Amino acid sequence: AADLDTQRSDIATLLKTSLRKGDTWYLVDSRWFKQWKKYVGFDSWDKYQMGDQNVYPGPIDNSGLLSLKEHLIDELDYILLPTEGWNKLVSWYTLMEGQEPIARKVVEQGMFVKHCKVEVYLTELKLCENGNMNNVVTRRFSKADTIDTIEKEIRKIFSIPDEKETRLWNKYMSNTFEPLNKPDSTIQDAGLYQGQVLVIEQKNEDGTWPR
C-alpha cells in the first residue's frame, strides 16, 4: 500500500481522466469509496479520521451494487475510475473474495450530436417477430450499435435463414409502427431507449410484405 497522501493524490488525479471512446472504466461502490476518502483525508476539513482503523475500507466491496440494481446514479451510488485507478485500489486493498470487477466501456452518447460517456447500462430492447408478437425476447445493446447490427442479431436470435429478407420496425409511443430504414443510424440516432419494442418482418414467399 502506498502512503495515504499518495493514494489521495493519485486517485484525485485519476478521477479526472479524460473520456476516450473505447477505454475501460470501473465502478466502485460509493459506500466503500466514502470510507476510503475518510481514511486518506480526501476532501476532509479536520482530517479527524485520516489513518484511523475505524475507517479502514477493507477489501474493495461492490456487493451493494448488485448485474446492477436499477436507478444507480454516478457520484451518488457509485464512482468511476479508469483502468489505472482501479488497478491501484486493487493492489492497495485487494478485491473482496468472490467478487469480480465491474467493467464498462466509454461510448459516444446522444442523438446524432454526441460526446463520450461510460456506458454503465446497456440499452435493453424488447424484440419480437411480426407473426408472433407475444413471443418477446429481451437483449441489451450498446448505444454504439447501428440498426444494421441490431437487425443481424435479431435474425440470429430468431434463427432467420440468410435467404429470407427482413425489415425492422419500432413501436413509437408504444403505438404506431415506424420504419427503421436507416441502417447506419445508431440506436440512439434512431431514438430507441430502454424497453423499446422492435418488430422484425419477413418478406413472404410470393414477394409481398406482411404489413
Curated annotation (Swiss-Prot):
The keyword Heme does not apply. This is Ubiquitin carboxyl-terminal hydrolase 15. Phosphorylated. Phosphorylation protects against ubiquitination and subsequent degradation by the proteasome. Ubiquitinated, leading to degradation by the proteasome. GO terms for cellular component: cytoplasm; cytosol; mitochondrion; nuclear body; nucleoplasm; nucleus. One of its GO terms (molecular function) is SMAD binding. The gene is USP15. Its main location: cytoplasm. A homodimer structure has been reported; however it is unclear whether the protein form a homodimer in vivo. Identified in a complex with the COP9 signalosome complex (CSN). Interacts with SMAD1, SMAD2 and SMAD3; the interaction is direct. Forms a complex with SMURF2 and SMAD7. Interacts with TGFBR1. Interacts with SART3; the interaction is direct. May interact with RNF20 and RNF40. May interact with PRKN. Interacts with INCA1. (Microbial infection) Interacts with human papillomavirus type 16 protein E6. GO terms for biological process: BMP signaling pathway; monoubiquitinated protein deubiquitination; negative regulation of antifungal innate immune response; negative regulation of transforming growth factor beta receptor signaling pathway; positive regulation of RIG-I signaling pathway; protein deubiquitination; protein K27-linked deubiquitination; proteolysis. The lineage of its organism: Eukaryota, Metazoa, Chordata, Craniata, Vertebrata. Residues 1-211 are annotated as: Mediates interaction with SART3. Expressed in skeletal muscle, kidney, heart, placenta, liver, thymus, lung, and ovary, with little or no expression in other tissues. Residues 2-107 form the DUSP domain. Signal peptide: none annotated. Hydrolase that removes conjugated ubiquitin from target proteins and regulates various pathways such as the TGF-beta receptor signaling, NF-kappa-B and RNF41/NRDP1-PRKN pathways. Acts as a key regulator of TGF-beta receptor signaling pathway, but the precise mechanism is still unclear: according to a report, acts by promoting deubiquitination of monoubiquitinated R-SMADs (SMAD1, SMAD2 and/or SMAD3), thereby alleviating inhibition of R-SMADs and promoting activation of TGF-beta target genes. It comes from the Eukaryota. The keyword Ribonucleoprotein does not apply. Keywords: Acetylation, Cytoplasm, Host-virus interaction, Hydrolase, Mitochondrion, Nucleus, Phosphoprotein, Protease, Thiol protease, Ubl conjugation, Ubl conjugation pathway. The chain holds residues 6 to 222 of 981 of the full protein. Belongs to the peptidase C19 family.
